[PDB]
Each structure stands twice: as C-alpha cells, then as structure tokens.
C-alpha cells in the first residue's frame, strides 16, 4: 500500500522526503510527489499522480468544483462552545422520554458528568461495559446471577494524556514543559515551563493563545478561564509604529497569505466589499481581484494575476508570486514575514500565525476603525473562518489508505506537524491532531453553508430564487411528470427538480436547490436532525374534512394510525409484560405498526435483545426461512416455497394476514388498530374470518392492563406521525402560504378542481402527496424539541429512546458537523 503526497514547494517536498526517512508505518508507504503551486497539485491528484495535499478552507472550495473533484477527507476537530458532557446529555435525554414505557436505561453518569465503564439496566439487571461514549462493548453483558462485570477505566483527559507521556513514566520530566489541569482534567488557563519560567495562555483544550507568551519577570496578560472556542479567525496585523485604522485601507500596501485563502483573500474582502471601501458589489463591477488591483498601492497576494497585486512579492524569477513556499512570503507566515520585512502595512493572516509573545511591535487592526493587542483576536478579527482539511479524489480510492497512514503517523509521533526547513510545511505548523471528517461530507458540509455561498458569491452572482416559488423535488419520472403538469397550471407558485430517492431530496433542499419534499416517517429523523421542519403534514382522516374545510380548526382525529398489540378475549392470562416467548404475528418485516414499533419497545426493555430471540414462534414475513420468525408462516395453500415471503403470496403477510395469523395459530398480532374492524362483525366475507365478533378481541396496554379493541387511542404501543412537507427553518412561512394557497385551488374542494388535482393523478399512485390524502394541515410548531413536537413522544420514545444519537443514515453526521460562521 502506498500513498503519494503532492508538495506545492522544494521545501514542502524537502520535509515530506524526510517523513518517508523517519516515519515508518507498517504495511503503508509514503511517497512524495512534487508540483509547483497549490492548483498544478490539485490536477495531479484530479489524474492520478497524486493522491493526498493539505489544502486551506478556501482551496478546499475550489477543489470541490467540477474541474478537480476533490473532497475534504480528514481535518483537526474544532471546538464552538462548552458542550454537556455526553452522559449528562443522555441522562436527560431518557429521563424526558414517555414515563409510560417503563423499564428504559438511563446512564449513571460519574462526579465529572462520565459514563462510569460499567453501566446497568436497573430493571433487567443487566450490566456491560462502555466506552467513553457510551457505547456498549458488545460481548461484555453479565446477567444479575453474576457480578458486574470489570470494565477498563476511562480513558484519560487531554491534559492527563499529555501529562502522563510527558512524565515517560519516571516521575518528573526535567527540564520539559509539564502541562498542568484542573479538577475537571482541562488545562488550567495559565500555563508554565517549569524550567524556563516563561507562562502562557491555552484554551480549555490546551491550545496556546498567541500573544500570551511571557519571559520570568514580566506580568503575564489574563487568561480567559473555560474557553471553548477553538475556531480559527482572520486577523489584520500591523506595526505599532503606524497609525491608520482600518478605514482609510485605501492606498496602502499589503501582504496577504494567498489570493485562493480565506484568511489572506475572502475575509478581508468580505469585510471591504460590507464596509464599502471596495467600489465593488457584483460581477458587472469587473472582477474582484481587479477591483481590489485598484484599492491597494502594492501587495503581494500569491497566485494573483494582477501587476500591482503580485509587486511586493520577492519570490525569484518564476517563482515569483506563486502559490507555494518557493515565494517566500506565501500563506500565513509568508504575510507576517512581507510585514516584518516592511514591504507592507498590513497583512492579512489567521490568529494560529500571531506572535506567541506578548510584547513587541505588533498589533490588530480591528474593522471597527480602532487597534488591540495580539491576545485580543477574538474581539478583534475579520470573521472566524473554517477549518482547513486533507483532500483526495471524490471517489474516495484511497480514502482509507490515506486516513490509516495518518492515524499510524500520529500514534508514533512522528513529526508531521514541524520542520527545520520552514514554517507550515505540509500541514499547518499548529495542528495537533487530524482526525477523519465523516464519510459523507463535502465541502458544502464541511465549510457550512455561510461560508460555501460566502465563498462562491466572489465569483458568480448568485441568483436568489423567489420566495413566491416552491421548487418541489421528486424522486422519479412519473412525480416530474405531476409535478410538470402543477407547474403549467400553478401561475409560476410550481416548479420542479429530480432526485433519486428522498434522501437526496434532503440534500437538495438543505444546499438550497429545492425548497420542499413529502417525507414518510422513515425520513424524518434524519430529515430533523439536519435541521429541516415540517411545514405542512398530510391529513388522512376520512370522517373529519372540517379542519380542511376551515383552516386553523382544532382537528379531534388526526387520523394517523395506532400500533396495537392485538389479543383473543379467550387468551385472559397474556399481557405486556408476560410476551417473552410466545406466539407473535407481524404484518412483515419493516413495517411501522408491525414491526419497528414493536421491535423498539422490545429493544428499550431487555437490553436491544433481538425480537427474533424474544418471541417463541412467530410468523413475520421478510424474515429468513429457517428462523423461528417463519415457523408460523404458510408459504401458499397452492403449494409451489414462497413460504415467508413479502408477497400476499404468504397467507399471513400484511393487515389481515397478521390478523389471520391471530386467529389461526397465532397468540399476539402487531398490527394498525384498524385491521380487527376491517375483519370481523361480518366484513371479510372468507371463512376463517366467517363473522367473526370485534368484542373477541382486546389490545394490551404497556401498563400491563388490557382494554377493548376500540380504546386504541389510549391503550396502543405508539400512534404514528402523519407525513410530513420538510423545507429550511426560514421557508416554512413561504412554503405554508404557498401551499395552502394551491390547496384552495386544487385541493379535494379547491375552486379549480378541474383544471388540477393535487392528490391524484393518470401518472401512478402516491405521486408527490399520498392519494388518500385529505388535505395539508399547518404544523402547529410547539415550544418543545423538534422530535418530540413531531413524532410525538410515545413514537419519540418507543422508536428512538428519545435520544438525538440515534444515526439511521449515515448522511447525519456530515450534515450535523458544526461550523466556523459569522453573524
Ligand atoms: N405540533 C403537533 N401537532 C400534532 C400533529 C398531529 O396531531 C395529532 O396526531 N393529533 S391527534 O390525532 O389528536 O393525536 N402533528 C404531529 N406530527 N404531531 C405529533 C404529536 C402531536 O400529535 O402532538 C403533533 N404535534
């Protein structure tokens, strides 16, 4: 296995040569690929001769355009404000669950808010061992006959970490910086070498502040206790011997870390183009480089075309102005050396760049016409800015050869993150630690969504789409086709895009190419956990078109349905809690009544044991043949095996096959509160169900009570969440407008019915809207969370224990990932 780094410079290509010498990780080898600038190595490993660089948050973006294809692959974690710890969280995430599903574990949670390493469920008296994140050790379950089981202690904090390996285990570290924490395992917020007697400020993390650094016999400034706020910020430095604010800019001369950075280009012009010193606002002003060519006397931006722009520059002959080290006042270091070296007045550069001491003839230039110190970047800057991240091919070919050499690299410590031949060499000289970005990211996740339209605003004017439209998205060609024939009629209020599946409906909404989507159940989780809303919900009570009639009526039924455990009359001694081992009928395998209902409340009472082990024997389609979930199945009275099978081939498959499965050979049936009706007192004319009478049957309470089939909505196992319209928080008004405006015209009473109807169509079933739809009902947004206020807390509690971890697609993860963003 092999990985080829592409290095920018002769210098970069210098130190990557020494990590193939020095650093030796089994079975990986690196390789070091020289180009001679940042964009030659992003064609290089676009085509193959490379595979890996490091790029800036604002290469990052362009890497993802269409010309290159690159994606951000691993990255230093980042910090934006003191979180709860994780077992605290989950703590209050059970306790808030629905109280009547009883028997659910709730985490203890140690002196400094941790998971103690063994955790229990008290009712079952089951205990195991968890890792730091709680995360069940699987194979490590003792039953209450034995003693809890002996379970690692917790891994250590940062600063014990590095407290420990700095001791090397020989009780002091003479001569040797000893980092020194807190009650709770953080860095204390002033730290001291020990031997030096120079101290200094880190974050909670253990992050140094620059400007903080302090030789014995001077005061140190005050450091900030229970700082959390690890993102990077663009910083304007200057000489304390000049005196210009940051207004009168104009005419100046300038050093910027690079025309593609964030810190050296789009922060700073961000903050011109808001301020108006820039006569610029959109691409009929020129270019920005071009306008920017006009505001400063002199710079040196490398990579820039303009003459001006690249004169104070001193790279030799071809070098000159290039985005590599071979220019010698490239990226952030480069900028603060062009200052130092007085070939400009201002450079433009990130905080992790500034001086580690505190006194000297530097300070910031603050956007607000005024001048602080170096350790006061936080109040002094031109915006936080995103992290910057390792890149390769989209296709992510060696995706995992490039994470496993880097994770080796770190755990060997080799020396990745200096070099003697210069500064921010490879990677940036501050990263401590590069971890590995979710599997789904993209840049438009990675950067967040303020700064990817930020980013792409200096290059294109950005057309906004109306708010008088709703761009609805479809995941195949008969719902175009509908959605096609809504648009011709809706006056413009329609239009339509193409997705795949529903998930990428999500996404299209979330990167603001479409506006709405209906969602089954299934897709709101994730659908809520990446921050969308349900607008509208799809109303399917057929015994009530009042609330759709008047809108904004109180709604008596919502209609949905409810899970039931369904039960013979005859069968008195079967309740709730009694279940373990007997006979079970489920609709199939997948269903929501039958099935993921039943089987979370199974999981959050004994301890995610499987419903195939709980139940004796049981008929649930879908399910593999030789399995006890089949030995109640009957394949086909007309003998083929089809015996199991997700087809009404299976007798027992379905609502009234679930039913049949009671009656027959059956003890318990999971079903939708509906299907006892829809069978007995005469409505299925076949001969099992004969007349059968709906007072033979009762439902089972989680209380362990029973009640009459007709109670179902306060004797079920969860009521289901209607379908829901999902758009962005700041749409939902527009959305509901909009759609409550076209139901007026096209709905089942809409006063142009005949020109469209938006719950049917010649196209096939369910296009866009169920067709049994009754009408669409505004969401009646409540003060609680999201998930509860949605999928109500029953459903909340019995599917997903409450809890905001739960991670049922793997595009969770990259559209949570938190960002560096500005107000
Ligand atoms: N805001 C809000 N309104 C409700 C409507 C459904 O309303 C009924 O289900 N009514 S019911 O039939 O009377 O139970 N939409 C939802 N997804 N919800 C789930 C929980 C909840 O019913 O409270 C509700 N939350």
Redo the contacts with the bound molecule.
């Keep these: 296995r092999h990985v080829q780094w592409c290095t920018i410079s002769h210098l970069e290509q210098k130190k990557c040569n020494d990590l193939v010498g020095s650093c030796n990780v089994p079975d990986i080898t690196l390789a070091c690929v020289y180009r001679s600038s940042t964009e030659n190595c992003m064609a290089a490993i676009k085509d193959g001769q490379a595979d890996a660089m490091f790029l800036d948050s604002g290469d990052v973006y362009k890497a993802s355009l269409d010309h290159y294809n690159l994606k951000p692959i691993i990255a230093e974690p980042y910090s934006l404000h003191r979180e709860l710890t994780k077992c605290l969280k989950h703590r209050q995430e059970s306790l808030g669950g629905d109280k009547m599903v009883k028997g659910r574990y709730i985490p203890q949670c140690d002196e400094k808010g941790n998971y103690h390493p063994v955790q229990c469920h008290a009712s079952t008296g089951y205990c195991w061992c968890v890792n730091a994140n709680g995360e069940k050790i699987e194979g490590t379950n003792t039953t209450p006959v034995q003693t809890p089981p002996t379970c690692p202690s917790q891994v250590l904090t940062k600063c014990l970490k590095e407290r420990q390996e700095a001791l090397g285990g020989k009780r002091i570290a003479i001569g040797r910086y000893i980092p020194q924490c807190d009650e709770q395992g953080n860095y204390r917020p002033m730290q001291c070498h020990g031997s030096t007697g120079y101290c200094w400020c880190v974050n909670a993390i253990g992050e140094k502040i620059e400007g903080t650094n302090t030789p014995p016999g001077n005061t140190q400034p005050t450091c900030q206790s229970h700082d959390w706020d690890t993102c990077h910020y663009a910083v304007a430095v200057v000489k304390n011997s000049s005196t210009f604010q940051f207004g009168q800019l104009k005419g100046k001369r300038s050093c910027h870390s690079g025309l593609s950075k964030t810190d050296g280009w789009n922060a700073p012009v961000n903050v011109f183009v808001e301020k108006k010193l820039l006569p610029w606002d959109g691409l009929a002003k020129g270019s920005i480089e071009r306008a920017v060519s006009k505001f400063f006397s002199a710079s040196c931006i490398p990579g820039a075309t303009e003459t001006n722009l690249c004169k104070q520059c001193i790279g030799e002959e071809e070098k000159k102005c290039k985005s590599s080290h071979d220019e010698p006042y490239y990226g952030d270091h480069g900028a603060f050396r062009c200052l130092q070296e007085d070939k400009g007045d201002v450079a433009f550069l990130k905080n992790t760049a500034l001086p580690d001491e505190h006194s000297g003839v530097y300070e910031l230039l603050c956007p607000d016409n005024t001048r602080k110190p170096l350790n006061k970047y936080k109040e002094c800057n031109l915006g936080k800015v995103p992290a910057d991240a390792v890149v390769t091919r989209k296709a992510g070919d060696k995706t995992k050869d490039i994470n496993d050499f880097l994770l080796e690299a770190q755990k060997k410590k080799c020396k990745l993150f200096g070099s003697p031949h210069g500064k921010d060499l490879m990677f940036d000289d501050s990263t401590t630690h590069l971890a590995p970005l979710p599997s789904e990211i993209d840049a438009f996740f990675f950067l967040g969504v303020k700064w990817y339209n930020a980013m792409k605003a200096l290059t294109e004017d950005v057309k906004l789409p109306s708010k008088n439209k709703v761009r609805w998205c479809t995941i195949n060609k008969p719902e175009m086709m509908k959605c096609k024939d809504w648009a011709a009629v809706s006056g413009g209020a329609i239009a339509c895009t193409e997705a795949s599946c529903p998930e990428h409906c999500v996404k299209q909404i979330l990167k603001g190419e479409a506006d709405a989507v209906t969602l089954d159940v299934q897709y709101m989780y994730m659908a809520l956990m990446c921050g969308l809303l349900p607008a509208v919900?799809e109303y399917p009570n057929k015994d009530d078109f009042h609330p759709c009639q008047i809108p904004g009526s109180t709604?008596?039924?919502?209609?949905?349905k409810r899970a039931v455990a369904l039960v013979k009359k005859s069968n008195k001694d079967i309740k709730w809690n009694n279940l373990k081992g007997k006979k079970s009928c489920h609709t199939h395998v997948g269903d929501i009544p039958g099935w993921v209902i039943p089987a979370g409340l199974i999981s959050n009472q004994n301890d995610n044991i499987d419903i195939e082990s709980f139940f004796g024997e049981s008929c649930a389609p879908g399910s593999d043949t030789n399995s006890k979930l089949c030995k109640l199945c009957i394949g086909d009275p007309e003998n083929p095996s089809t015996r199991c099978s997700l087809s009404d081939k299976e007798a027992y498959y379905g609502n009234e096959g679930a039913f049949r499965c009671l009656v027959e050979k059956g003890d318990v049936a999971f079903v939708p509160h509906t299907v006892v009706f829809a069978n007995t007192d005469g409505k299925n004319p076949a001969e099992w169900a004969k007349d059968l009478k709906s007072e033979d049957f009762e439902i089972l309470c989680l209380d362990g009570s029973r009640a009459p089939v007709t109670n179902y909505r306060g004797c079920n196992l969860s009521?289901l969440?209607?379908r829901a319209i999902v758009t962005r928080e700041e749409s939902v008004s527009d959305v509901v407008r909009i759609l409550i405006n076209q139901q007026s015209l096209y709905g089942r009473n809409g006063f142009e019915k005949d020109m469209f109807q938006m719950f049917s169509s010649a196209k096939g079933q369910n296009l866009l809207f169920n067709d049994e739809t009754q009408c669409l009902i505004e969401?009646?947004?409540?003060p609680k969370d999201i998930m509860e206020?949605?999928?109500?807390v029953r459903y909340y509690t019995a599917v997903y224990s409450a809890s905001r971890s739960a991670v049922p697609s793997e595009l969770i993860p990259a559209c949570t990932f938190k960002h560096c963003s500005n107000s």
């Design positions: 919900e709604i008596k039924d919502f209609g949905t009521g969440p209607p969401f009646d947004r409540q206020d949605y999928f109500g």
